[PDB]
Amino acid sequence: ALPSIQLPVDYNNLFNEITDFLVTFKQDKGPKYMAMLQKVANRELNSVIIDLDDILQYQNEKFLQGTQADDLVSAIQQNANHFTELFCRAIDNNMPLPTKEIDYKDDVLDVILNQRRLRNERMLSDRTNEIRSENLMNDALREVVEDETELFPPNLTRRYFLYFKPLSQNCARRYRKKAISSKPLSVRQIK
Amino acid sequence: APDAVFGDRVRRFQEFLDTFTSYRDSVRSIQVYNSNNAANYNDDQDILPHRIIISLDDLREFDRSFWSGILVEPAYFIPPAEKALTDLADSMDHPWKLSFKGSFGAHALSPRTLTAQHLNKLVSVEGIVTKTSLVRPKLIRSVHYAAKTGRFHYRDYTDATTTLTTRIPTPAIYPTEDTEGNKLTTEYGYSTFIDHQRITVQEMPEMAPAGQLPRSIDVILDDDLVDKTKPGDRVNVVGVFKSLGAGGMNQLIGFKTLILGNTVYPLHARSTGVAARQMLTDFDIRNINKLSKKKDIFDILSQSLAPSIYGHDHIKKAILLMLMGGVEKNLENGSHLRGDINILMVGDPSTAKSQLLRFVLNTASLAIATTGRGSSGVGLTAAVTTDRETGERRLEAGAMVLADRGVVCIDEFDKMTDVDRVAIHEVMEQQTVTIAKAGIHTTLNARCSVIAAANPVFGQYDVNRDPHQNIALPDSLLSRFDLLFVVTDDINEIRDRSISEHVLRTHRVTIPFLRKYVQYAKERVIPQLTQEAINVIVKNYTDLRNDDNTKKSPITARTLETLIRLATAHAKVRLSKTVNKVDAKVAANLLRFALL
Amino acid sequence: APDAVFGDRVRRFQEFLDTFTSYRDSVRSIQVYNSNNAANYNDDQDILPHRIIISLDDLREFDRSFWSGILVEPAYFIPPAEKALTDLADSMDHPWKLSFKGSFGAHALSPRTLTAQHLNKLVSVEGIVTKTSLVRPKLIRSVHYAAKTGRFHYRDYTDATTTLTTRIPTPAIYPTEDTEGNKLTTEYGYSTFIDHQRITVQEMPEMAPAGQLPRSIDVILDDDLVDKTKPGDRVNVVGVFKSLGAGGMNQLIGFKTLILGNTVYPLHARSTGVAARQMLTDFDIRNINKLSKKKDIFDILSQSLAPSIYGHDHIKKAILLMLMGGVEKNLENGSHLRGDINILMVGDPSTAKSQLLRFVLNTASLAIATTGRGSSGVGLTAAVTTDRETGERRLEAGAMVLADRGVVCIDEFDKMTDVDRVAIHEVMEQQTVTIAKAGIHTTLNARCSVIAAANPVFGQYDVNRDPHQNIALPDSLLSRFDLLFVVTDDINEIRDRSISEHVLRTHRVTIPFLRKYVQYAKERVIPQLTQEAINVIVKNYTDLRNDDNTKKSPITARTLETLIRLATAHAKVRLSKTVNKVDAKVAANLLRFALL
DNA sequence: CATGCATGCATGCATGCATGCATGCATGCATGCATGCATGCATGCATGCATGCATGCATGCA
DNA sequence: TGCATGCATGCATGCATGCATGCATGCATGCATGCATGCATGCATGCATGCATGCATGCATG
Numbered sequence A: 001a002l003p004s005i006q007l008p009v010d011y012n013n014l015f016n017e018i019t020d021f022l023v024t025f026k027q028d029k030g031p032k033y034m035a036m037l038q039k040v041a042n043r044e045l046n047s048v049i050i051d052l053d054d055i056l057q058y059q060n061e062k063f064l065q066g067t068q069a070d071d072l073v074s075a076i077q078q079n080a081n082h083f084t085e086l087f088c089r090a091i092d093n094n095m096p097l098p099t100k101e102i103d104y105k106d107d108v109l110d111v112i113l114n115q116r117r118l119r120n121e122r123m124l125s126d127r128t129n130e131i132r133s134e135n136l137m138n139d140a141l142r143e144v145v146e147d148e149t150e151l152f153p154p155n156l157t158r159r160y161f162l163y164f165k166p167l168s169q170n171c172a173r174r175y176r177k178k179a180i181s182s183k184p185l186s187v188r189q190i191k
Numbered sequence B, C: 001a002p003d004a005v006f007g008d009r010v011r012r013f014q015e016f017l018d019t020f021t022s023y024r025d026s027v028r029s030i031q032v033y034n035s036n037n038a039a040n041y042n043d044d045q046d047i048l049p050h051r052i053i054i055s056l057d058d059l060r061e062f063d064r065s066f067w068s069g070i071l072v073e074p075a076y077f078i079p080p081a082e083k084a085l086t087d088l089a090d091s092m093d094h095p096w097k098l099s100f101k102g103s104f105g106a107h108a109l110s111p112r113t114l115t116a117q118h119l120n121k122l123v124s125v126e127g128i129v130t131k132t133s134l135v136r137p138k139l140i141r142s143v144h145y146a147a148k149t150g151r152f153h154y155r156d157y158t159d160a161t162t163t164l165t166t167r168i169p170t171p172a173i174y175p176t177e178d179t180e181g182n183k184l185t186t187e188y189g190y191s192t193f194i195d196h197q198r199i200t201v202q203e204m205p206e207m208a209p210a211g212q213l214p215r216s217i218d219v220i221l222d223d224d225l226v227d228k229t230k231p232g233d234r235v236n237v238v239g240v241f242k243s244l245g246a247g248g249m250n251q252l253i254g255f256k257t258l259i260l261g262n263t264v265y266p267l268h269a270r271s272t273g274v275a276a277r278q279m280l281t282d283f284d285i286r287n288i289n290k291l292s293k294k295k296d297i298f299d300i301l302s303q304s305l306a307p308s309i310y311g312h313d314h315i316k317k318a319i320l321l322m323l324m325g326g327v328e329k330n331l332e333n334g335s336h337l338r339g340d341i342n343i344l345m346v347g348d349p350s351t352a353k354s355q356l357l358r359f360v361l362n363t364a365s366l367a368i369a370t371t372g373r374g375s376s377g378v379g380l381t382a383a384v385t386t387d388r389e390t391g392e393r394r395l396e397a398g399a400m401v402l403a404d405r406g407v408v409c410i411d412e413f414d415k416m417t418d419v420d421r422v423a424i425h426e427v428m429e430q431q432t433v434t435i436a437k438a439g440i441h442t443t444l445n446a447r448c449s450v451i452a453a454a455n456p457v458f459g460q461y462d463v464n465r466d467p468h469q470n471i472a473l474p475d476s477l478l479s480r481f482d483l484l485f486v487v488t489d490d491i492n493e494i495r496d497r498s499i500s501e502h503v504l505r506t507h508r509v510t511i512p513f514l515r516k517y518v519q520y521a522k523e524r525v526i527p528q529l530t531q532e533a534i535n536v537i538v539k540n541y542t543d544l545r546n547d548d549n550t551k552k553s554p555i556t557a558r559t560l561e562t563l564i565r566l567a568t569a570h571a572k573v574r575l576s577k578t579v580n581k582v583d584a585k586v587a588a589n590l591l592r593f594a595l596l
Numbered sequence D: 001c002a003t004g005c006a007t008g009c010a011t012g013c014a015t016g017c018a019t020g021c022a023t024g025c026a027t028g029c030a031t032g033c034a035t036g037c038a039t040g041c042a043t044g045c046a047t048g049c050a051t052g053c054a055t056g057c058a059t060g061c062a
Numbered sequence E: 001t002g003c004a005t006g007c008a009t010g011c012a013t014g015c016a017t018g019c020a021t022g023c024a025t026g027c028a029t030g031c032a033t034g035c036a037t038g039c040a041t042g043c044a045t046g047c048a049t050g051c052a053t054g055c056a057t058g059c060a061t062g
């Protein structure tokens, strides 16, 4: 009962390569989206806009300089719903967090998430004290704290949003790839 | 493992499927084209379903037993023949359904008299398509991802509609928390889906009795067969009359019925829908190519369209040209320029005025006879929907909406009130209809060709008093109509003689060849204007402004737009690609008889 | 369709099944022989199952994961490997089961300590076969004929025992009146059937503690594995410990257990069952063929059997010959003529009398040590069954019954009462046992070889008083025994010297080579008497009647029957096919030392 | 003064009885579950009212 | 005296207004069924009382 199917779609190395493209981008002073993420960390913007062209520009870039990249345009193009949160939890790995002292008149939403950030860490600071005080490298000592305490989930304190953006035919005119997402289609054409 | 019965229906039909090689090349062309369809889509950049028409002819001359078994209990012979057919598809190189085309006098009965007899049989029903429901897709195969194990899964769902055999129903709940406790995260895209539709069919009104309550049944469609019909046509339906459901014996009448396993065939009406399904052989077009190499065939086609009517030579010439329709060139980011031609005639009664009208209707394609009033929904849709599924507003396509790319037959034009005449300025000039009621303001397209017929105001006074105001019509309606034909009441004896032997021989090259020659010219004969087309009509149109105004009125630049259309449609008849000066020589003469 | 998991266990094991080609030639020989088995049965006129031994060796040196998965949860790796193995059977040219041979220190525990731990695992259990149930066949596939339609049908039935996975149970009632109302007339023969058996296994008494209540479990067998064990042996069992049944949670303890998917291996005891599974290589028999080409190997084999005992040369010579057993020629429609040889010895105590006995036991095959009394079931079966399944009488095979084709070791023969001595005349002479109690009179076969040992009546007086009545035994028992050896108490110093250094070097060619040489001679070395065998013993036996009666007594013609056996067994040692005069020259000397 | 025979007595084992102990058959008793109905909510069809328009009639003008 | 123009009046084409009609749903009532208890039945198992066997003794034997 309830069998299983293997498929060529992976979730593992795609999450690895999507971390690198989210970090390593220089073309359009320093990194593009981290300065945007610092602007998100500046707490003055709510949207995150992701194209498909810099992806395809990166996918042109990796094959010409390195051995092989996993395809990621047509990967997102197929299912496109699991790519929302599996992409967005990789964003919260790297963040210039304290980049500005909080304003007193900034946001009533902002003062709540600052608590749940801090209440998470103060609760985290308590449990690591009791365990070292009752002994019998500290990574496992860190790991014991990880599973013995109920926490707020990281899905609960986000404050931002992410919208995708379809690719134009213009860069697809240079290198033809899976440009099927952007055609002026009809409701009658919606099979 | 199958029994002996199942393979015998296979091998007997496989014997028939090996008997006739005509269907072999059919599926061959299906596979080669769809291979080439995917070949061009996947080589430079870097549709068709699976069903084959089988007639009801050959089964009688092959197996009268297998003939008979289908026509009574189809639920035993349809599955193995398809399984054998999918064998042929896999052996020579997915459902792979069929048609069962064929005429039979067994079960071509009315749906009005269909119920409680011939149940669980295959019945051919025709009638009216009405109240078409919404197109929904159907869930079949669910896909689930488990987080920690990192694998996918597999799960299907079935319903009793498709299988055609009463199998033991095994419902399955949509899965969550399957084996150990990992969350079954749902996915999409790879989960497969198939569209679905259900419609109702009313019987034929021409077959119906004088007045009684009509009764109807329902038809559910399948994947490649969703949405072939708009509501309001005449369609033959061939399928199997199946009754499902527990008829009230569980705990006042059950056993509601339907028809599945269907093929859909829209058929031509008198005044509704497409009649352009007429084939053209190479033997056919070779006759047309032999015909078009002549020099006087416009005369022969002119004289052809009066099979029982004496005279009216120059009137018939335009009736060729309206069905030609002119050329359409929509401007780059501007507006369209109207190409069709609209004519009103006038004359004294009993002078072949009503002897012209149905001849215009029956010979042409997609015509609607509009008589008397046209109130509240001829030019409109009126948006009256009180749809019980949800509070919303939809449209019911009116006749002027419905007659697109066609002809509108207007009878007794003078009796029309001024109300719908507001819409006629909108229809005839901008080729669009915008309906703005409080529910939804709309905008649609209709580029119909128009022929109307009005009487004189009083008596037969067509020439006596004055040529102006024999009609007393609004002023722009003069500018709307292109040619205004006046038929006299000339009393003679030589003319009476030509009337005499004509009607006497009446009561004691062809039409079906004609409409083949007509509809062929639409998709390949549009011409383009040349330098010689300018020089005559520039000299000619100045004469139309300088001296016709000394005789009659009006002369607008809109008249010159019709001068383009007449030379346009004349080149369609000769099937030329350029435009010759002779086309203008024909077109110049057409204004003289129409006016002077 | 299978998932990704199921094919991966296949392709990984298919990688192993392609890794080692030794099992490839195994199944090849299975198919070729059974093809040739059906070839000879179906060409002139006008058995073997499907399982292959796989060791537990190579899986550790190939896949430690697939090693581990079997040893914990076997219910996931056993089905796909067999499916892959049936693939190999179908690809190179029906269950096709396996063995899982192999020694492992993981789960070779006692059944006494087995319960509630290691459930749903594969456990190797050894112990005692007891209370074997009856052999029943099992119904699988029913066949039904309908009269009027004239066709057959198809119907199967399954149970939870075979499948090893908990599948949804779907019971089906045995069919009658299927579709329309034709009588489902039953048939047979083509309906398939498979035998079935269940048995219980008690643990080892040698492994058991001193005294406590023994506890046991049950084993159900399969088709080719029905009835390999009689009740009363020592058998290793390798299978999977499975618990079925709803453990009392439906409406005080459920969850009764059993072991399925089994292989059966009978193992040698100290005094029970077969030990003839010893192999013979071509390297082995070439040594035997090099050995048998000599002239004095009877002496070397005589001196070999006293590893720690001084003297007794002519005694050891006969102990070779009893294990040879003589020849058996049953007459045409007459009676058998007895071929084995039975010897009693007598002597003073502490003179290697008890130093002989277990050496006779351990070196030989299928021996039973019988000590003291033999009351009520040694020579008998006693028929005591109070079988709860039905009122009936069965047998429990006694030791004299059980020791067929073997040796019976009788210790302290003089202390036996006269009761069982009645049976000894029946056993030693007619080679049969007939038991006639009020339930069922019976008759069975037992042709055991007998060695007994009695003491003198009083003191060590072996030579002093008279040679007659040092035993005071019944008269026919003199005639029952073949040679009567008398061991003296000779006191010397040279003889004491040979005793001296023998025991001193004791506390500070071979046996396993020997029993290979013994059991090989049984199935191919029987000889046939020649003309030269008559002429000596005719002259010799007359001397045995004319002059031995002037010295001792008795001389019967039964003594001449032993004279045949001695020359018979001597030819078995030299592996000759004829009988030489020298065999009689050996046999003539054997009577002189035994008597005079 | 040293053995053999007839005589008498002590004692362990075979078994046909009395009795306790496993499957089916039967009957009284109490817990739980499918389901039709009274009720409420959402929706389509038909009539009176305001009225632009076509028509008949009164009017002066050539 | 005949004709064009302005004024009074019926018609039926859209907005308010009334009511009949169809569909979703939570609850009280009836009935199939598991479960406790004791029985007639069928069959395995312990037991005690008297006979043949072993040993001591009186008598006879040589």
Ligand SMILES: Nc1ncnc2c1ncn2[C@@H]1O[C@H](COP(=O)(O)OP(=O)(O)O)[C@@H](O)[C@H]1O
Pocket (backbone or CB within 6 Å): B308, B309, B310, B311, B348, B349, B350, B351, B352, B353, B354, B355, B356, B502
């Ligand atoms: N030129 C003609 N040749 C033959 N028949 C004619 C001709 N003119 C009139 N008719 C007759 O006139 C009849 C049609 O009258 P029609 O003028 O069409 O009606 P209406 O004037 O009322 O629209 C036909 O039956 C036809 O026989």
Ligand SMILES: Nc1ncnc2c1ncn2[C@@H]1O[C@H](COP(=O)(O)OP(=O)(O)O)[C@@H](O)[C@H]1O
Pocket (backbone or CB within 6 Å): C308, C309, C310, C311, C348, C349, C350, C351, C352, C353, C354, C355, C356, C502
């Ligand atoms: N000829 C011999 N050589 C070596 N050991 C001997 C010999 N005769 C007797 N023995 C010793 O005698 C013992 C066996 O005594 P045995 O005569 O068998 O017992 P019983 O006479 O009671 O049946 C053994 O331990 C063995 O050491």
